[PDB]
Design a protein around this nucleic acid. Structure first.
Ligand SMILES: [Zn+2]
Lengths: 83, 141, 177, 117, 49, 76, 94
RNA sequence: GAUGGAGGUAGAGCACUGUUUGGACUAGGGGCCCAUCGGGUUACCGAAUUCAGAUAAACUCCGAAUGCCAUUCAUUUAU
RNA sequence: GGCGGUCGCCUCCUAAAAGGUAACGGAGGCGCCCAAAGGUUCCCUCAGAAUGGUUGGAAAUCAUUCGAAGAGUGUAAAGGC
RNA sequence: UGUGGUGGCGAUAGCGAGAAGGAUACACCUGUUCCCAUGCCGAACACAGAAGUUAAGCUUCUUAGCGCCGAUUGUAGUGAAGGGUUUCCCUUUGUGAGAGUAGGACGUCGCCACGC
């Protein structure tokens, strides 16, 4: 680490609509809101909308949409009409 | 006037040779081969005519390798030019053959075809040729 | 950081199991991370690194270097001494901070996601993760970033084969497919 | 990834340095050795290769820790044992290192206590 | 573009040395600290004019 | 009408003092062009790689293993 | 098996030029049993075994006693005459 | 006559530069792929790659006979 | 003889393994550049090839591995490093 | 004895492939406040120490796949002396390579400290 040639950085709290994953750092700062012990006396300005759970991939693939029923189209729309 | 073989040179005027003697270079691949027994050059054409007169009285191909190739270049002046100024233009090619060397080699046909062809060929070269076969080893392979 | 904790408390015993090292020293680690922002346009317009290096300083925590030209190419119009690319190396805790960023916030900001390609083995395990854009990280803003450059993350390990590295990175994020 | 075995590079720099002067006729050589924990020294001659006086970081007699303390101590011991046999024209072999105190403090300790560079 | 040039002592006024430069790389008179023989002491030398 | 027949002068390289000879201080030994014979005991190299002697004495050529050769002067 | 094997001279002078005009082959043997001694041979003797046996059978040298099982290694003969020169032998054990 | 040395000649040799003839192969290209993914097919071949076999004045991993330079050396001779 | 070409300097070959050696013999360059491309004291090792990786192209920057030299040396060629 | 340091001798000492080890020693490693450092980066270099470990380096041992050193022979070539065609060849006399190859070889010698 040299001097005067490295930008700002602080252990800014990360957060989201859930999960309070308040441990990481960053380089964007501002209005102080979380000076707390359990984490860094820092900022939750990072209110990213991805918990690493929004995209159901780290929470595993969900059934968020289907997008599954093409066969019943002929087999239910006039297939309810069938039987 | 047909061009059998040539090269890519890197040099044009080469000092004319000096041929002394040789021994070795026995049969390599085929079963029947020539053997020049003198000291002389050999032009491009002579080898070409030899290859033709071997192919024709052969048939169905039969393995035939041309175990020599012109490398060195040639030169000449024009008639009516007094001696003097720098070397003349280059025209031709030549690869000198000492005695003992082996020019051609064949296999794939019984001797009668072989000696037929390899006596037809030896009338196109200024060398006193001979005839030898692929002889013997500790392992023929 | 939390990773180092999680690392020395979970990764070491699990991996010591899955291969039975005669010594814990035999562990496959993570060594460094290098970042590669190739402008490729300074020869045309040298007024692009002027912002590339800035966006970098924002992504990492340090100002990048500036790689030279090293040779001369006409179809490219390359003369030696010209700058084309700018890099940073990550070590120490910042490694883990930035990798936490990647696995936890950065990666899941990319549209139409399936995960990382399963094939960056190199037969020696230094997996890379190409990126198209640079609008991903929250350290970057809409009306301030006016290009679509990319980087080439080159993570390195101490593994010899690729399965060790794969199932290691599995323990440390890397949402594969 | 491999790691370059650090003693090798210092060996190489040593071999380049040594190429300037050993000259250990009657103005015999000095020496130096690092480690993770200790420091050693000998006063050597050529062509014999037979040293004349030695010392030891933590093998004979010292006070402090692996630093100038140990360094200066060893240097004092070297210079004392040297003038015993009457040597005042040593040629200092840098080894393959620099001057920053584990070698430099050793050096100047060797100077004052009675050896001439 | 190159020119044979003569340095000269800034104190004793002796044209002591001779050398050459590129009159468009370095368009300023040179200043080197050569050694004068007339007084046996280093002396700021300046290009002739 | 040629464009040849251009030549330089000779420069007369080649050793100028054999072995077992008694050489006085200063003499030349083996005029080179680039290093072909590394110098040795009391032998010094000049600007154009020539090899002179520093002390009076006797010459002997030897070899440095596989690399190259040497000259040196062992005074009496 | 009971052959024409005898002695020779170290570096004999142009006595060799005539050795090639009167039917002689300067031959050699160096190997395991006994170290190295130049040794006679000509062209008609061994071709008997060659035709009878072939091209690699165990060849034995004699002073009418124990044998040297030579395994003749290389002989690239002087061309333009089709006759043997420089027969480089070799000898191994069982 | 004896001993020590400098140097790349006549050989001959493919380790480098050139020149080069066959065998194998795939590196995959060669007009299509054969086709509106299974192998790119017939064919061309260089290198990646190899197995043999050739040649040089401005090619050398090597290299004599001779001359040449020296010696508090020896024997005859006489410059 | 003329008409053509050449007239000084450096490198290779011819040159017959000390040095020297012609030809209107076979091949190339020179009539400068550099205030650092010098002096000194520290430190470092190349061309490639394979394998991965946005724009990226067969060929830019990167990363890993193999690599005695196949690089580089202001300028022509030998000899060196 | 072993281990560390430090020199000579043509790589016959090397390359490659495989096993063993940690008392001391060496090294890996724990860190940056401190002299010192990064054309960004305690990786390098420099400093502060001993949590942990022989996985690696590292030293000991095995191996003729590769790299090297190779005799005695034969053959090419040649000084001197001759003889034929004089493009070339041949014979006495003195010397005699390169290729090929038996074989050797997984070092030898010297010093200083430590303790078992
Ligand atoms: Zn003055």
């Amino acid at each position: 680490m040299k001097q005067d040639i490295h930008p700002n950085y602080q252990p800014v709290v990360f957060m989201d609509s859930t999960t309070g994953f308040k441990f990481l750092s960053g380089s964007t700062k501002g209005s102080s809101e979380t000076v707390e012990w359990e984490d860094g006396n820092t900022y939750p300005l990072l209110r990213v909308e991805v918990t690493s759970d929004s995209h159901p991939f780290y929470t595993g693939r969900q059934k968020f949409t289907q997008a599954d029923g093409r066969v019943d189209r002929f087999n239910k729309k006039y297939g309810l009409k069938d039987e | 006037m047909l061009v059998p073989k040539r090269v890519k040179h890197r040099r044009e005027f080469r000092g004319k040779m000096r041929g002394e003697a040789k021994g070795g270079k026995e049969v390599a691949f085929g079963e029947w081969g020539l053997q020049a027994t003198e000291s002389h050059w050999i032009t491009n054409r002579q080898i070409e005519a030899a290859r033709i007169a071997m192919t024709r009285y052969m048939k169905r191909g039969g393995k035939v390798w041309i175990k020599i190739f012109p490398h060195k270049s040639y030169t000449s002046k024009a008639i009516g030019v007094r001696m003097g100024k720098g070397k003349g233009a280059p025209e031709g090619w030549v690869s000198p053959v000492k005695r003992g060397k082996i020019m051609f080699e064949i296999a794939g046909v019984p001797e009668e075809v072989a000696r037929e062809a390899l006596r037809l060929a030896s009338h196109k070269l200024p060398v006193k040729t001979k005839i030898v076969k692929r002889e013997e080893m500790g392992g023929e392979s | 950081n939390r990773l180092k904790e999680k690392y020395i408390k979970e990764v070491t015993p699990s991996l010591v199991e899955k291969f039975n090292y005669s010594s814990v020293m035999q562990t496959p680690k993570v060594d460094k991370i290098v970042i590669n922002m190739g402008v490729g346009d300074a020869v045309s317009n040298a007024k692009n690194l002027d912002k590339a290096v800035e966006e970098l300083a924002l992504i990492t925590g340090q100002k990048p270097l500036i790689t030279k030209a090293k040779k001369s190419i006409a179809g490219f119009r390359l003369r030696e001494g010209m700058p084309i690319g700018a890099k940073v190396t990550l070590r120490g805790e910042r490694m883990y901070e930035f990798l936490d960023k990647l696995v936890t916030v950065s990666l899941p900001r990319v549209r139409d996601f399936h995960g990382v390609s399963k094939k960056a083995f190199d037969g020696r395990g230094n997996y890379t993760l190409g990126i198209k854009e640079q609008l991903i990280f929250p350290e970057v803003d809409y009306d301030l970033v006016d290009k679509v450059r990319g980087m080439d993350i080159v993570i390195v390990t101490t593994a010899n084969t690729d399965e060790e590295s794969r199932e290691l990175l599995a323990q440390l994020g890397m949402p594969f497919q | 990834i491999t790691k370059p075995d650090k003693n090798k590079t210092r060996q190489k720099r040593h071999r380049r340095v040594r190429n300037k002067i050993s000259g250990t006729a009657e103005c015999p050589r000095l020496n130096i050795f690092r480690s993770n924990k200790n420091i050693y020294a000998q006063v050597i001659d050529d062509v014999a290769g037979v040293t004349l006086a030695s010392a030891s970081a933590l093998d004979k007699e010292i006070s402090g820790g692996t630093k100038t303390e140990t360094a200066a101590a060893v240097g004092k011991l070297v210079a004392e044992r040297a003038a015993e046999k009457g040597i005042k024209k040593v040629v200092f072999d840098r080894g393959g290192y620099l001057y920053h105190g584990r070698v430099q403090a050793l050096a100047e300790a060797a100077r004052e206590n009675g050896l001439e560079f | 573009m190159r020119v044979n040039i003569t340095l000269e002592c800034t104190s004793c006024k002796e044209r002591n040395y001779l050398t050459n430069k590129n009159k468009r790389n370095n368009p300023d008179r040179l200043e080197k600290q050569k050694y004068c023989p007339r007084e046996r002491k280093v002396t700021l030398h300046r290009e002739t004019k | 009408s040629t464009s040849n027949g251009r030549d330089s002068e000779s420069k007369r390289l080649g050793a100028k003092s054999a072995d077992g000879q008694t050489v006085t201080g200063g003499s030349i030994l083996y005029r080179q062009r680039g290093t072909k014979i590394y110098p040795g005991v009391n032998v010094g190299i000049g600007g154009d790689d020539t090899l002179f002697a520093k002390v009076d004495g006797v010459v002997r050529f030897e070899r440095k293993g596989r690399d190259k050769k040497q000259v040196s002067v062992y005074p009496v | 098996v009971q052959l024409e094997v005898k002695e020779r001279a170290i570096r004999p002078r142009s006595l060799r030029n005539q050795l090639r005009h009167e039917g002689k082959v300067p031959a050699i043997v160096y190997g395991y049993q006994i170290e190295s001694t130049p040794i006679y041979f000509e062209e008609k003797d061994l071709s008997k075994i060659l035709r009878e046996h072939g091209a690699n059978t165990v060849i034995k040298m004699t002073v009418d006693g124990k044998n040297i099982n030579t395994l003749m290694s290389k002989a690239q003969l002087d061309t333009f005459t089709g006759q043997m020169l420089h027969v480089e032998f070799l000898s191994v054990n069982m």
